[PDB]
Design a protein around this ligand. Structure first.
Ligand SMILES: O=C(CSCCc1ccccc1)C(F)(F)F
Length: 185
């Protein structure tokens, strides 16, 4: 459940309802990690059908190392390009799937940096984005640059220091799936 590649591996003859793309926290294993990621993946699969959700982690060159949190974008440029690559693949393979996405900690910076740079038509296919412990919360004014704020939800705990420039279990299991579901329609 730490590694999910249903989008890379998916065929455009079998497009699902939902494509879910997740960027993990620093240090987490796989491309999904072991906290926020799998929890949102399971909630979505419960709502829509395991067969009607493609779950996809941002792996490849997104190494999730701590040092990269200090780069100007809060992550590496290769992690950002890999998330872009993946959203782009979702749109080429399945232009009608609802794309939803999530990030936890540094993955939050992968989500904000990739989405802010994508085309109008790709961003339109992204129906919802959930950010858990958003490391660029203050810098980005609680939103993703160039992406509609009604589609964005930030879970930023009062005691979460990264939010001022595992605390999110009920956010991930309960509040995030509902937010996403309200917009997948
Ligand atoms: O991916 C995240 C990166 S933010 C961690 C960097 C940091 C945390 C607390 C205090 C100083 C620096 C995390 F590692 F999951 F938290």
């Amino acid at each position: 459940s730490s590694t999910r590649n249903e989008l890379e591996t998916g065929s455009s003859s079998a497009c699902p309802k939902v494509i879910y793309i997740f960027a993990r926290a620093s240090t987490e294993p796989g491309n999904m990690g072991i906290s926020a990621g799998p929890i949102v993946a399971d909630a979505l699969e419960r709502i829509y059908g395991a067969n009607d959700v493609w779950v996809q982690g941002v792996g490849g060159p997104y190494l999730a190392d701590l040092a990269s949190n200090f780069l100007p974008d809060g992550t590496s440029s290769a992690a950002i390009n890999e998330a872009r690559r993946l959203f782009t693949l979702a749109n080429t393979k399945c232009p009608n799937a609802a794309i939803v996405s999530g990030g936890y900690s540094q993955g939050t910076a992968v989500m904000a940096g990739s989405i802010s740079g994508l085309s109008t038509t790709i961003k339109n296919q992204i129906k919802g984005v959930v950010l858990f412990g958003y490391t660029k919360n203050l810098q980005n004014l609680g939103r993703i640059p160039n992406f509609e704020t009604s589609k964005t939800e930030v879970y930023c705990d009062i005691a979460d220091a990264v939010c001022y420039g595992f605390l999110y279990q009920t956010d991930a299991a309960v509040a995030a799936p509902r937010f996403l579901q309200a917009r997948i329609g």
